[PDB]
Design a protein around this ligand. Sequence first.
Ligand SMILES: *[C@H](C[C@@H]1CNC(=[NH2+])N1)C(=O)O
Ligand SMILES: *[C@H](C[C@@H]1CNC(=[NH2+])N1)C(=O)O
Ligand SMILES: *[C@H](C[C@@H]1CNC(=[NH2+])N1)C(=O)O
Ligand SMILES: *[C@H](C[C@@H]1CNC(=[NH2+])N1)C(=O)O
Lengths: 261, 257, 261, 257
Amino acid sequence: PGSAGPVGYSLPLSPTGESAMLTPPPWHFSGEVVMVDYRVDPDAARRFLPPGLEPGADPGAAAAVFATWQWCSQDGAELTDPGRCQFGEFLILLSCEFEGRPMARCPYAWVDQAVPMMRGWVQGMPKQFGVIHQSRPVTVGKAGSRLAPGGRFDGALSVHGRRVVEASVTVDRSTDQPPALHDVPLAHTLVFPEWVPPRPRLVASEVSDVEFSPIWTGSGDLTFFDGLGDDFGALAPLEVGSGHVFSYGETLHGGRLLSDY
Amino acid sequence: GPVGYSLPLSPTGESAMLTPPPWHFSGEVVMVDYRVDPDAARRFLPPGLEPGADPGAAAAVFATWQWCSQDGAELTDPGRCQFGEFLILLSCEFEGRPMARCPYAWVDQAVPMMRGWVQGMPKQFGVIHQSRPVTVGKAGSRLAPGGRFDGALSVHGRRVVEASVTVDRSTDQPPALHDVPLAHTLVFPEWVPRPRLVASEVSDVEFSPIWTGSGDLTFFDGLGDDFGALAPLEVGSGHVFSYGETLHGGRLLSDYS
Amino acid sequence: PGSAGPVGYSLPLSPTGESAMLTPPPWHFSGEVVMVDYRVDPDAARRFLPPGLEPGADPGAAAAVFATWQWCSQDGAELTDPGRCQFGEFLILLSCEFEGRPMARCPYAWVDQAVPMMRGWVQGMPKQFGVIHQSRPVTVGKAGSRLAPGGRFDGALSVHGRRVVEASVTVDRSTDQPPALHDVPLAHTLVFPEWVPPRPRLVASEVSDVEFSPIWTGSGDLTFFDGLGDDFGALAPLEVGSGHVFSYGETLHGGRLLSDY
Amino acid sequence: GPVGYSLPLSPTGESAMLTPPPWHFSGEVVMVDYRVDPDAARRFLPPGLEPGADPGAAAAVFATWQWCSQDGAELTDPGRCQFGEFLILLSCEFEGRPMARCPYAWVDQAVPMMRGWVQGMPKQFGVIHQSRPVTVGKAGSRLAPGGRFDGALSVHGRRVVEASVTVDRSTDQPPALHDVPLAHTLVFPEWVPRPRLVASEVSDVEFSPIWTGSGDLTFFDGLGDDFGALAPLEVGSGHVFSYGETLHGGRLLSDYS
Ligand SMILES: *[C@H](C[C@@H]1CNC(=[NH2+])N1)C(=O)O
Ligand SMILES: *[C@H](C[C@@H]1CNC(=[NH2+])N1)C(=O)O
Ligand SMILES: *[C@H](C[C@@H]1CNC(=[NH2+])N1)C(=O)O
Ligand SMILES: *[C@H](C[C@@H]1CNC(=[NH2+])N1)C(=O)O
């Protein structure tokens, strides 16, 4: 009501607010996921947990998650421009707990589009830019795999021209049991660098209307390669477990404060 | 000396950019049938290719593909086996047999581009986007009545084509221009100072059920007056479906001798 | 000294701090610029000036600025990886004043790399992602222009697959007079969206060791196209003035608060 | 029917992806001379091309180019007239005359890639980065003693080559492998079930002063054992310079009849 200067949910500010790079939440997501469960060094994982987050009930449980998404705002406007509403993503997830409640920590994430990257920082998800590839199921022809026993699906991440992660799943059966780390709240750290010479906050992403397709599960394989530094390398798999292929949706509304310390 | 199906030659032949056919394709298509000026279409038909039984029938075709060679090796590297594509198709005939001519095509990966020229398909490079059906959540459309699917092509940073389909029913009737042989012109520029009309030989052609509904198509400036001549006079039905084929090689229609 | 959780100048946090996407300033920049001075609707320009910034001494003075940069941190480490240390940029600049002192406001900017984009938001420069092309001078052969009378240089910006801006300069003489809008402080608005249900600050970017090559100046041409919305379109040229081609360097240290309101 | 120097054919010929030669090039080069296993190099030489007077001499060449046709039209669209390139060169001879063979090349734009195959230059697609000299500020090197310049190539998301040069002096001596004719193999895959050895004809070859100093070069895995066979045994001098030429067409060295 009072406002004088230019406005907007985000930069760039403009007289009408229409120029802003980001739209206010809620945002809807619909995606396809290729995920591998793995065993991480629990002491290594612990060092990525900020104060307030404790080790998971199974401290060594981790996951590598490839996904391709479509997203839109409440009005659905972005959906008519597929170039604007799609992105690929790779995440690491670590098991943790907040006040006794299972959650996941995402210490590393990459995406291949700028809007999702910046929107990640708004939520505290530490998204960087990368090149991200993922197999898609086919239903006709021979050039791919079906969502059926024996179907194989692969994921790859490169960053700055170097291969960082490769994952594979060969599915053998369908279940109605969502993978644990993809079915708990994510606990992020909101912090942004200080330009004029920071107060981090631990937040949970608030979601609704979480939906999974049937889950196709089988063997998993996962390989980390050099090219992201030793801090990242500490989270490489000790052992690799089951892989999972499924579709996922949710609505993301905003943050809930877990601790402002 | 060094060998290979294609450049670069190498001692074992492994370095070649392209592998020998056959190649398998599995793709997701968003296609719009439209009416083109028949006189404009005729001017894109080389000798031997005559106007369709329906000279004005054309189509704009967006697709996303996975492909592989006979051994399937490319499938394990999604970054190497995937590409997006936009094509124009024109109805024509050769010796009384219905076919389609592709006067323009764009892809977003180099191997499929070069492989296109091998077959005579006139692929250039572009930026190509296409809606994907969803089955969970709210951020997209289902393959079901009322589902909408969009396609866009930009070239050299300029928007060139936008298409949309809103489906209303499923059928087992493949879109006509996507179910006839393609007749290409095999020609490569002379570097040291002879075109052939060929058809792509395919097998194991497979369609999913075809979701069909309204179609919409717009051409924008940015590719020149020759291309603009093929802009729609009227836009017909749209179709969303999956498609597979195996592509084996070429068959000579004419070498003009 | 006390720190427990993972750390870093920016996300992602890590045990050593090495994983952070951004490095602390200062950052050094060395670039090549193709710039066109133009006349903007002063009333339109005014609406992009937040409280505290007044219209420029010449309220209708604006510029369109294409640049290609190399950048590095104090240790110079980024320079050995050209893919990491280079980016292209397009900016709009508007003339304004703070407490009587000439400055420039950048209402819109685009870059083609993720690190520079995020670093822009840290400073309040409203960078989005785009495709940005710019001619470079040649010194041998025929496939280009020399930095000499008659030399022509072009710039183009596309965003989401649509052409947004095209500029051209044909130079006819060399001067030692830096273009006014490229030789004054930039006044940005620091603001980041609030995730847990904003306090903007007006800041100036503090720079040192500003250096210009000889300036090649001549006719300018500039065209805006649709595809960024009516707020942006309000800043299209009424008339187009001189163009300038030159090399530029500076060291960027941090922000100085102009007003926290 | 429709015409054109290259596909796609069109009624006026304007749609063609490629324009007829001559084409002008102006580029900035970062090059490292190195020693290759002569036996490995020999295996990449087709019949008619014999080992160099110095069989082990090779070079790794990074360049950034602007190009245009005779009318200069492409120059006004920087996005259409610019590309980056990485090449391997091997010393060889044809009928006693020194030449260079390019067994591998990569570029980052589609037109130059296709145009390469027209000439017989075995270009593939890659991601190619190269340092640029600066003249103001601190974020780079000057073309002056102690200046360092780096090059990198990735293909399909894997790093393949890194090179570096630290210059110490200026000379008027063009690097040998960048100052001899290139001998290519013109061949295109048969689609309906005959290579030629050709040289690229150039004129108006121009070098800036050559800044020369130490060179460093590393190959990484990621392209196969054939390519790996050309990895350096030893690395020599590096050179940073500007280069221009006009490329007119091909001259037949042999058609093997
Ligand atoms: C980034 C984060 C989304 C939300 N959940 C994900 N796995 N990715 C964004 O908002 O685009
Ligand atoms: C290019 C051509 C393919 C075959 N049919 C198409 N619609 N695209 C290629 O071989 O990759
Ligand atoms: C973004 C901003 C730089 C600083 N000045 C510019 N003109 N661009 C960044 O820090 O990379
Ligand atoms: C590819 C080949 C050019 C000519 N000489 C080079 N080093 N690259 C093209 O024609 O664009």
